[PDB]
Amino acid sequence: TDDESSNKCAKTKRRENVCRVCGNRSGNDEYYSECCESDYRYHRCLDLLRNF
Known about the structure:
CATH topology: Diphtheria Toxin Repressor, domain 2
Number of helices: 3
PDB class: toxin
Assembly: monomeric
Oligomer: monomer
Largest sheet: none
Strand content: under 5%
Structural class: mainly alpha
Keywords: Kv1.3, Centipede, Toxin, Blocker
Number of strands: 0
Shape: globular
Order of helices and strands: HHH
Entry title: NMR study of k-Ssm1a
Distance between the termini: 30 Å
Radius of gyration: 10 Å
Name: k-Ssm1a
């Protein structure tokens, strides 16, 4: 059993998808890692995925 201390993207599938989709939507391979960052960014990425 792992914790968020490892990777929030591994704590849930949606989290991993939000990061992958975020990079594609914005068109930046870097954005992918952004979502994996503190929730501060994770929530910011969801804004774009709002129109999923």
